[PDB]
Amino acid sequence: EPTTVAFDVRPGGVVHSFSHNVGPGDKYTCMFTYASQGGTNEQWQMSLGTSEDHQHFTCTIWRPQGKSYLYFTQFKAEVRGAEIEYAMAYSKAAFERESDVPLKTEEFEVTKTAVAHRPGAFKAELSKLVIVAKA
């Protein structure tokens, strides 16, 4: 029943996935799959929001305070069975004196169901993903 859940983003280079679902029959699903290098785990948050029209929903994945130290070698946020209407990925998110810093055009790709890194162009820094979708 919580709409927001905490999860650990783990270094070590092995691929991990974390997912959360809300709504009748887990209608609204969001999954974050990644692999990273680093010294410590990072507790991130995944929030799923639902709108009045029973169709639109949002998935927001982020690291509190907007800075991540992990070297991501891959990432993919997926909303299976849904259609993305808006999405943005950030290397750094706004906090105190820092501004949001969107990933550069070449770093990622937005398909109907996913926001994913672009192999060979992604710069490895990520701290926030925002997805607005229609179930």
Per domain, the residue ranges of the chain are 1-135
| Contact criterion met (CB below 8 Å) for 69 and 103 | no
Residue 36: in which H helix or E strand, if any? Answer: strand 28-37
Determination method here?
A: X-ray
CA–CA separation, 127 vs 40, rounded Å?
15
Non-local (6+) Cβ contacts of 97 within 8 A are none
Tell me the structure's resolution in angstroms, rounded to a single decimal. Answer: 1.6
Q: To which residue do tokens 């507790």 refer?
A: 43
For 105: left if phi > 0, alpha if psi spans -120 to 50, otherwise beta; the answer is alpha
| Nearest Cα to Cα of residue 131 among 18, 32, 16 | 32
- In sequence order, the β-bridge partners of residue 89 are 129
Apex CA 120: angle with CA 130 and CA 113, to 5°?
35
Q: What tokens does 11 get? A: 């270094």
Largest CA distance in the chain: 43
Q: Please, what's the b/e burial string for 59-98 (b: 16 or more CB within 10 A of its CB; e: otherwise)? A: bbbbbeebebebebeebbbbbeebebeebebbbbbeeeee
Give the integer Cα–Cα distance in Å for 62 and 101.
13
Q: Which residue is it, tokens 């948050």?
A: 45
What value, to the nearest 5°, has the Cα angle with vertex 79 and ends 16 and 133?
145
In sequence order, what are the beta bridge partners of 48? 59
What six digits make up the tokens of 15? 């691929």
**Contact assessment for residue 54 and residue 22, using Cβ atoms and an 8 Å cutoff:** no
